[PDB]
Amino acid sequence: QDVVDLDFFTQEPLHLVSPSFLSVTIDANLATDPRFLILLGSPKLRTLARGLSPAYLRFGGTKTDFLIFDPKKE
Amino acid sequence: FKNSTYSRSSVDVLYTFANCSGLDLIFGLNALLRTADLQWNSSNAQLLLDYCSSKGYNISWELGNEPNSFLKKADIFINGSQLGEDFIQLHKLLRKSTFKNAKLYGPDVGQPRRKTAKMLKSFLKAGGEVIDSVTWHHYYLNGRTATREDFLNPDVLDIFISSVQKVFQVVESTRPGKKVWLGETSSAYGGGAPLLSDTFAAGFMWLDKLGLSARMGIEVVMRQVFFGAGNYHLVDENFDPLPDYWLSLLFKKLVGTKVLMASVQGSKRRKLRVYLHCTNTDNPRYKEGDLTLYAINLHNVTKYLRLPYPFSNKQVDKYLLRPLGPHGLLSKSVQLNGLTLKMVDDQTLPPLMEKPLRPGSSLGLPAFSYSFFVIRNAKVAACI
Ligand SMILES: *[C@@H]1O[C@H](CO[C@@H]2O[C@@H](C)[C@@H](O)[C@@H](O)[C@@H]2O)[C@@H](O)[C@H](O)[C@H]1NC(C)=O
Ligand SMILES: *[C@@H]1[C@H](O)[C@@H](O)[C@H](O[C@@H]2C[C@@H](O)[C@H](O)[C@@H](CO)O2)[C@@H](C(=O)O)[C@H]1O
Ligand SMILES: *[C@@H]1O[C@H](CO)[C@@H](O)[C@H](O)[C@H]1NC(C)=O
Ligand SMILES: *[C@@H]1O[C@H](CO)[C@@H](O)[C@H](O)[C@H]1NC(C)=O
Ligand SMILES: *[C@@H]1O[C@H](CO)[C@@H](O)[C@H](O)[C@H]1NC(C)=O
Ligand SMILES: *[C@@H]1O[C@H](CO)[C@@H](O)[C@H](O)[C@H]1NC(C)=O
Ligand SMILES: [Cl-]
Ligand SMILES: [Cl-]
């Protein structure tokens, strides 16, 4: 027998997730790629990104703790 | 690991990518900048906060990534108490900024091993008052050693439940009711499992993780990564979507914020994994009270699911995902109801086309597959 009965609890919501429940990261390491500007400038990638809105985008990773902001750099 | 600098330019690329994509940016600050007496040195963060203010950038903040492994990474040990004080200091900086209401998340600890649970507990005692959400991380496998069988093993999927229970035990003991987020998560660490983390086979772990996260009280799940070098990326090096991107998009179109519960009447209750939410009300095909069921079949045969009273005779839309051949579960291409999912062009996502079933038919779920089912006119009061 490959038939399976489901039981549903539908009385009340057991939890409420954020509308952004399914969110994404960009690893901090990607900012050390010389092509950072070209990659994130890609119209094709922005279309895919828009598809997942609403979402958080976390810019973070091991490299979070080895990145220093330098306002002089170009 | 070496110190690297980044420019105002890099900050603008990142902010613009998020802003123009409708995403909310969370920026992790460097927690290893330390004073003589091993307090956090906030002076570099200060320069970034100033610059972001001056550009009107609406940005959320984190401080540090996996502080539990700082000793391993940088031969510096910061305890949870100190890290809490460091977060208190960042909170005071944010309150004095132009975005005084900016959100602060942390501490982005790894999964709750004894030493990580201790760090999280002391961090929440000290710094818990100033964070808007508790972030922690989870991986099922080591990308180097992960096997195809591991990706399909319900005993591997099940370990995530104990991780979640252990995090909530620490949070309920220190800051009851604080929101709990997965701040970094995927199939496998070390950049993913070669030829596995970028395939149809990655989808069992991703959809199970979403299901269980929602069911167990996790409010947000952050997928490592949207795009990047790791083969757990949703989008490859050519900006082409992989099966997990299509799975993620379909989850967003169908699955609502209100979490319910499904279970299988059998005692086995393994390999057949079921989740139930209210349908996403923003979906124009569906209406208040509709349900979205999603199911994973890790059996090597088709299973037939029967909906309970009073949903037995309802019109159901199927959204079944299966790999495009010839590489089976190791495929990087997916079909929805037998239609290959492909961009229309660089600016155009395809429609995601339902397959209506005959009312009162059993829900067919092939071996090694996953599907969404929307139950139309379910008229569930809790969903309205
Ligand atoms: C298939 O998997 C078997 C164990 O699973 C059980 O048997 C199959 C036929 C399904 O009914 C499933 O629901 C059961 O839980 C293995 O022992 C077997 O060698 C595998 N392959 C086959 C039979 O094709
Ligand atoms: C979580 C960390 O915070 C991530 O930075 C880390 O990934 C990064 C980037 C990835 O491309 C690389 O393969 C790995 C390991 O060198 O570091 C995550 C991971 O995949 O291990 C995880 O530790
Ligand atoms: C990074 O910078 C800090 C101070 O700017 C310094 O103390 C530390 O040695 C550097 N870390 C590494 C791993 O080189
Ligand atoms: C923090 O770092 C800056 C520059 O890296 C340094 O000049 C400053 O004296 C440090 N502040 C403290 C309080 O140690
Ligand atoms: C920043 O972003 C979020 C929406 O994602 C919003 O709730 C908040 O009001 C914004 N804050 C400001 C000050 O613009
Ligand atoms: C944590 O570290 C701080 C800073 O080094 C130290 O002063 C404090 O006593 C430590 N806390 C515990 C509980 O050991
Ligand atoms: Cl600690
Ligand atoms: Cl990357």
Residue numbers in the entry:
A (entry chain B): 1 to 74
B (entry chain A): 160 to 543
Task: Quote the study that presented this structure, word for word.
Heparanase (HPSE) is a mammalian endo-β-D-glucuronidase (hereafter, endo-β-glucuronidase) that plays a key role in HS polysaccharide degradation. Humans express two distinct and unrelated β-glucuronidases: endo-β-glucuronidase HPSE falls under the GH79 family of the sequence-based Carbohydrate Active enZymes (CAZy) classification, while exo-β-glucuronidase GUSB is a CAZy GH2 family enzyme involved in lysosomal mucopolysaccharide breakdown. Enzymatic attack by glycosidases upon the electrophilic epoxide “warhead” of cyclophellitol-derived molecules leads to alkylation of a catalytically essential nucleophile residue, resulting in covalent and irreversible inhibition. Herein, we present HS-configured pseudodisaccharides, featuring a cyclitol epoxide designed to bind selectively to the HPSE active site and react with its essential catalytic nucleophile residue.
We also examined the effect of 2′ modified deoxy-, amino- and GlcNAz- NRE sugar conjugates (43–). We further analyzed the molecular basis of interaction between our inhibitors and their targets by X-ray crystallography, using ligand soaking to derivatize enzymes in crystallo. 2, 3, and 4 were all observed to specifically occupy the HPSE active site cleft, with covalent linkages between their pseudoanomeric (C1) carbons and the enzyme nucleophile Glu343. Noncovalent interactions for 2–4 within the HPSE cleft were generally similar to those previously characterized for HS substrates, albeit with a ∼17° rotation around C1′ for the NRE deoxy-sugar of 4 (compared to 2), owing to its lack of 2′ substituent. Using cABPP, pseudomonosaccharide 1 proved to be an ineffective HPSE inhibitor up to 10 μM, while 2, 3, and 4 all displayed nanomolar HPSE inhibition potencies. Effective HPSE inhibition by 4 clearly demonstrates some tolerance of nonnatural 2′ modifications in pseudodisaccharide inhibitors, although the weaker inhibition of 5 and 6 suggests that positive charge or steric bulk at 2′ are poorly tolerated.
